[PDB]
């Protein structure tokens, strides 16, 4: 009962953490190359705690001379699920994926006609990472109508020398659902059938990088992604070549974890109308130190604003807290979070610093309950909460 008094205030923090970060795929026109540029960050969980980041840079250039749609700035959201086929002797990856355009608020080309139904997909990649060659064959299909891909990947050369997740980004964004108001912004479909070239450089923080080059085009009725990948400067024992990444990753919101999110949701949603406004989000951040402009609040809300109505619908909110427990935060992000409470920087959250936050955030919290709270997390016994004591209060299971 003092336990969830953490889970509430902790999720409220990890929510402002999420709204402050850039988890999507940010697309902008590249008129220079009559094509587009994209950039996003990828979170790879490490099987024994922590996260590997992969900072992605992306060029798309069309293959033919056909006029193409060059979009205003928007983004995609991807939701990847990796599983195994249990009949499958070979090194493989079953990939389900949902891909949705958003980030233009409220107020078709020949190409789209080609994606109206279900389309066969074939993927062929030849890889060299630190000189370990491998090859990968995929088949599956894309209902563009829903933003759904289903694909199976086999490593044709035996054992893959890199964790499968690192390849997911590399192994067909022409299957994104664009909403009706955004159809004039789908370059990918516009470029079909002749195709686009998809070039990426992918930096794994504290490790090597991939250079990828991909022909994505129709061959008959089948959409085909052919890829060369070249990895350099990886560490023999680092997270990639040491296969130290989680494959599976946890997709299970216990009944009870959704309810933790609603208790949080309701800290922002002060009027209980089931949506969070710039006004309400401002109110909570101000009572927690930060002091952002109208501009920042709109851009934070627009990071998670599916319907593009300029507010966080209770559902839009759950989606984002689901993400933020699915993928591990970085040490930078946890520190930023700590420093919301550790309002002096000494590396310890005092009884008197928890009060300052709790009672600035608007809760009764008499000097009895405040201490019941501290004691909850205080493993080493010191009457204060240190950074590693904090990371325990901010994890699942
Ligand atoms: Ca509200
Ligand atoms: Ca919304
Ligand atoms: Ca302190
Ligand atoms: Ca302590
Ligand atoms: Na340009
Ligand atoms: Na073209
Ligand atoms: Na190669
Ligand atoms: Na690039
Ligand atoms: Na290459």
Numbering used by the authors: 39 to 145, 159 to 222, 226 to 451
The paper states:
Here we constructed the prototype of a photo-switchable Ca2+ sensor based on GCaMP5G that can be switched with 405/488-nm light and describe its molecular mechanisms at the structural level, including the importance of the interaction of the core barrel structure of the fluorescent protein with the Ca2+ receptor moiety. We engineered a prototype rsGEI based on the conventional Ca2+ indicator GCaMP5G28 by coupling cis/trans photo-isomerization, which underlies the photo-switching, to Ca2+ binding. In the present work we introduce the concept of rsGEIs. These sensors show photo-switching only when bound to the molecule of interest.
Several iterations led to variant rsGCaMP1.1, which shows a Ca2+ response similar to GCaMP5G but exhibits photochromism-based photo-switching in the Ca2+ bound form. We elucidated the structures of Ca2+-bound rsGCaMP1.1 at equilibrium and the 488-nm switched-off state to 2.15 and 2.90 Å, respectively. The crystal was switchable following 488- and 405-nm illumination, suggesting preservation of native switching characteristics. The chromophore shows a cis/trans isomerization between the ON and OFF state. The HT involves a rotation about both the τ- and φ-bond and a partial transfer of the double-bond character (i- to p-position). This is in contrast to the OBF, which is primarily a rotation about the τ-bond of the methine bridge, preserving the i-position of the double bond. The effect is most apparent with V54 of β-sheet 7 (V151 in rsEGFP2) that sterically blocks the position of the OBF-derived trans-chromophore of rsEGFP2 in rsGCaMP1.1.
